[PDB]
Amino acid sequence: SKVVVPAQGKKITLQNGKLNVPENPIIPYIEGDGIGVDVTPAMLKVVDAAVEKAYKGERKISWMEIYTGEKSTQVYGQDVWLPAETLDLIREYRVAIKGPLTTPVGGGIRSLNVALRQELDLYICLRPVRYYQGTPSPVKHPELTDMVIFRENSEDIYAGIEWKADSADAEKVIKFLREEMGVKKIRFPEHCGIGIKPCSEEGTKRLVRAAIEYAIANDRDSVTLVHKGNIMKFTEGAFKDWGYQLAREEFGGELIDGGPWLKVKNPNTGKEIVIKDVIADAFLQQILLRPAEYDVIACMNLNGDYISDALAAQVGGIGIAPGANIGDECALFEATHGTAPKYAGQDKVNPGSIILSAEMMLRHMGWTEAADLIVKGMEGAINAKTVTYDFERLMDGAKLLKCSEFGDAIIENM
Amino acid sequence: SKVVVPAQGKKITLQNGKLNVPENPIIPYIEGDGIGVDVTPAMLKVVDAAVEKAYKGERKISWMEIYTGEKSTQVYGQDVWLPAETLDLIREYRVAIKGPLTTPVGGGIRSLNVALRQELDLYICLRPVRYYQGTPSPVKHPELTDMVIFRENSEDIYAGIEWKADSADAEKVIKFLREEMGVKKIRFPEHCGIGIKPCSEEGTKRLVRAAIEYAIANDRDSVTLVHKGNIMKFTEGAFKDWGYQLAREEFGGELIDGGPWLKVKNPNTGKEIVIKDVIADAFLQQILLRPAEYDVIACMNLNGDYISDALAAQVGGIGIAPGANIGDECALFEATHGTAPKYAGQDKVNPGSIILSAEMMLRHMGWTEAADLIVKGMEGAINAKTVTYDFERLMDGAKLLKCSEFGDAIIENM
Ligand SMILES: NC(=O)c1ccc[n+]([C@@H]2O[C@H](COP(=O)([O-])OP(=O)(O)OC[C@H]3O[C@@H](n4cnc5c(O)ncnc54)[C@H](OP(=O)(O)O)[C@@H]3O)[C@@H](O)[C@H]2O)c1
Ligand SMILES: NC(=O)c1ccc[n+]([C@@H]2O[C@H](COP(=O)([O-])OP(=O)(O)OC[C@H]3O[C@@H](n4cnc5c(O)ncnc54)[C@H](OP(=O)(O)O)[C@@H]3O)[C@@H](O)[C@H]2O)c1
Ligand SMILES: [Mg+2]
Ligand SMILES: [Mg+2]
């Protein structure tokens, strides 16, 4: 009802598991709450400039704004935080992007970001993390970090199945667990909240499958399965076992030494990709102490959350970390940082995150030239130390830029 | 049957919620698997030296070795990994300490470390983390880190309640969830593992209670409740709500500004202790970017695992991180790092972790003088760069020492 489909522009379609993108594709976008009002306009201009430069005017995106979050309430009404139309529009146009999102509290509403991911079944949470020269970082050698996180995005405790303490449902579940399943490990059964942790084999192998194919298509060195399987054997541990099994079953994985590591040969470059695994808590230590040993990462939903945020912070890219939610039919790229209401509307915020997510979007669309130009632009702008306040306040000799001005700096460095 | 109670020596007792420790207390200790054979003898000698120096020979510990893990199998038999006697002996002597521990794989045995914690109901996992000058660290300013982690140690998914995919029990649980609880969020119900996440109110407030009393007795600046309550509202979020409520209920917590932070006045120093909270994933970023803003931390079992390991790695103390498991009746201090079988028996390993855990043990025993001397010793030895290979290999100008030699260096610096 309130969305306006672009007069000029054409729908992207999916054929043969492959995207068919017109030169004039219509792309849905969500402004985002808080600073989304600052970063998204900058993102629109940077992407258009990259597309214009790369294809000489032969291609052009027809942006179409759709709504979710606060602006949705103001467009559709009181408690319309996520209109069904938004979901239909992302399905119909295949690819879309959105800015910061905030969930309401006090109304029993669960995460809108997760709702998008689960109802569009974007089971892949892709977070590429690497260091941009010139970025202020808390660690000594952030350049050693160059990883690609494949976060399972549909299942685990992150899936929102739980019951409140003292509620009739929670006591019912606890009764079933203690009396019918013989559970004795619940230390305090009364006044106790209960949550469910699911992890299936199909969900695990389509995620790991995507991670290995990514390592192959991008010639990466290895794929590490991160889990907490020594404590959670049937979910975390199963994820790791199913991951190795997939590698053996579909990619000719061979045993390295006496195991458990495997090696998969890259069908295109002949490189032997190492398949290995590391327990999650020790991994949070290894990304700091031996970051160069890791590359592509495959893990569950919650651990992926933790890992991606920790890696982003160590390379100083907490506000420029790109992110994408991908499934077999649809794809939603997104800022990954918060709404930042206290600077919203001041044209202060750092647009690097949503812009790099737009870079991932264009590359996903096959427009690798334009995506390359955006990376080049971020490269030069940050290296030139012409950046926003979140960077500049942590360093010396930098030129402070507004959010919009930083967008121009990126374009200038393309 | 194979343990030998010290001829000379007396049992520690608990009276009025307060430990009564004799000058000649008997202390049970577990050597530990792998490098435990290297670090524990060094720990024994360092503690004895600190006790001898601090009380002029008037006090002395009567060590008593008890077994768990591989040595237990070789002492008690084939699959005796954790003899009931060990548990009885820790109960009877109140305080004990143990080296690295490894769980068997392939026999359906769950974590021995967790088994100890849950059957002795040591619901407090205490991990003090701060930087020792001279320690090689991956971050720029490790000195800014000075935190005390209070990890809930008895409940959460860490409690081992789960069922294997395709097993009759898992399908039974899934059937109950879908058909009797109306669960629709399990993406793939078949071939799916299931785990249970419990979190009670009593378990939460006795843990947070201990953290606040610790902030009071040690005059710390604040207590931060770390959780992932925006996704797991009834466990993680409940933990955070119950934490604030406890602070209000028992420590006169007052609202700061418009909330949610609270302030508790230290009854002994008048200092206003800040009670606040931070979402777990963002917290893993904050410990790196703004470490000086945090002090005492209160959180659930799994997050505590992650947080303590990440903090230990950033201050370069992955092998010297002290740790303790404390309950209302018993206490078990422990190395916190792995078994390191590939250097076991070579007198290479770093004994700093179990020694600092022994320092926590002595202080818990009221022997603060002796504990102070151990900290002093670690202080000087590390600052003097006379350390073991794990430190020395990451730095220049250091004097390489064997594990035992490092123990002597600590004594020499008391
Ligand atoms: N991908 C997303 O769309 C996304 C992700 C995460 C959260 N959020 C949402 O946003 C809402 C806003 O509220 P909050 O203020 O309590 O957020 P918050 O806890 O996420 O704050 C993140 C902090 O990072 C900094 N920051 C974030 N984005 C930045 C940018 O672009 N440039 C510079 N600094 C940036 C600000 O810290 P300082 O610079 O002040 O230190 C900021 O307040 C949250 O409720 C959350 O629902 C959206
Ligand atoms: N608190 C405990 O008692 C405790 C804790 C955690 C694990 N463990 C147990 O130990 C077993 C041993 O097997 P793993 O070798 O596969 O272990 P692992 O994955 O824990 O290895 C930890 C790594 O840290 C280093 N390290 C650990 N302790 C060290 C010390 O004291 N000094 C110097 N470096 C040290 C070694 O790495 P590099 O120096 O080689 O890089 C080491 O292999 C594990 O199965 C686990 O059950 C015991
Ligand atoms: Mg996250
Ligand atoms: Mg741990």
Swiss-Prot record, chains A, B:
- Binding positions (Mn(2+)): 305, 309
The reaction(s) catalysed by this protein are: D-threo-isocitrate + NADP(+) = 2-oxoglutarate + CO2 + NADPH
Taxonomic lineage of the native organism:
Bacteria, Pseudomonadati, Pseudomonadota, Gammaproteobacteria, Enterobacterales
Which organism does this record belong to?
Escherichia coli (strain K12)
Can you name this protein?
Isocitrate dehydrogenase [NADP]
Q: What class of enzyme is it?
A: oxidoreductase
Biological role stated in the UniProt entry: Catalyzes the oxidative decarboxylation of isocitrate to 2-oxoglutarate and carbon dioxide with the concomitant reduction of NADP(+).
On pH dependence, the entry says: Optimum pH is 7-9. Exhibits maximum stability at pH 6.
On cofactor binding, the record's note says:
Binds 1 Mg(2+) or Mn(2+) ion per subunit. Both Mn(2+) and Mg(2+) can be used, but Mn(2+) is 10-fold more effective than Mg(2+) in vitro at the same concentration.
- Write out the residues that bind Mg(2+): 305
- EC number from the UniProt entry: 1.1.1.42
The feature of type site (Critical for catalysis) is located at: 158, 228
Q: What does the entry list as the binding residues for NADP(+)?
A: 102, 337-343, 350, 389, 393
Encoding gene per record: icd
Q: Which NCBIfam families match?
A: PRK07006.1 (NF005425), prok_nadp_idh (TIGR00183)
Task: Give the sites modified to Phosphoserine.
Answer: 111
Keyword list (alphabetical) reads: Acetylation, Glyoxylate bypass, Magnesium, Manganese, Metal-binding, NADP, Oxidoreductase, Phosphoprotein, Tricarboxylic acid cycle
One GO term of the biological process aspect: glyoxylate cycle
Q: What is the effect of changing residue 240 to E?
A: Strongly impairs enzymatic activity
Q: Which residues of this UniProt protein bind D-threo-isocitrate? A: 111, 113, 117, 127, 151
